[PDB]
Design a protein around this ligand. Structure first.
Ligand SMILES: Nc1ncnc(N2CC[C@@H](Oc3ccncc3)C2)c1Cl
Length: 167
């Protein structure tokens, strides 16, 4: 038993809710919240901009030190940093950005990072401003992640389409 509430169960291990991941994170304090990161950990907009704003820019400060030491992430890669006031840890995961021309096949590699964590609160990777189809992202999630994932979908209209079209 865990503290996630109001989720619809899609599979043995994937759950989905119409929720703001920031508000969801502040209430649940999950062990891991996933950020929709880019390789530079520049948290300017979308999920990343929202999560970072909720940390009063502490996520960005930590991220800039990470990049100065380690260099950029790979598309499809991840790093574990602090969850600040939102979670114990933040798993920064880089899905391919279609608006930058990145290969969509890298979406599966991106979701594989979730398997290193038993339970996660996450957005749909490569959705929103990353330009991929969220229905495809949900399919890849279900077919790749084996650990327990709680997906927060900000847009109610999108949440209803994802559920109604789920196979
Ligand atoms: N998945 C998302 N994609 C893009 N923007 C989002 N947010 C939530 C509200 C606002 O973010 C904050 C964050 C901290 N204080 C007030 C508002 C935009 C989200 Cl939740």
């Amino acid at each position: 038993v865990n503290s996630f509430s109001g989720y619809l169960k899609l599979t043995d291990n994937v759950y989905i809710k119409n929720a703001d991941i920031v508000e969801e994170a502040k209430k649940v304090k999950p062990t891991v919240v996933v950020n929709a990161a880019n390789v530079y950990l520049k948290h300017g907009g979308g999920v990343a901009g929202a999560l970072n704003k909720a940390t009063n820019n502490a996520m960005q400060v930590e991220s800039d030190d990470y990049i100065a030491t380690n260099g950029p992430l790979k598309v499809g890669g991840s790093c574990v940093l602090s969850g600040h006031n939102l979670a114990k840890h933040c798993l920064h995961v880089v899905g391919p950005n279609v608006n930058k021309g990145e290969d969509i096949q890298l979406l599966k590699s991106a979701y594989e990072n979730f398997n290193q964590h038993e339970v996660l609160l996450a957005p749909l990777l490569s959705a929103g401003i990353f330009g991929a189809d969220p229905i495809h992202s949900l399919r890849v999630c279900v077919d790749t992640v084996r650990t327990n994932v709680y997906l927060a979908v900000f847009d109610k209209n999108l949440y209803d389409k994802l559920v109604s079209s789920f196979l």
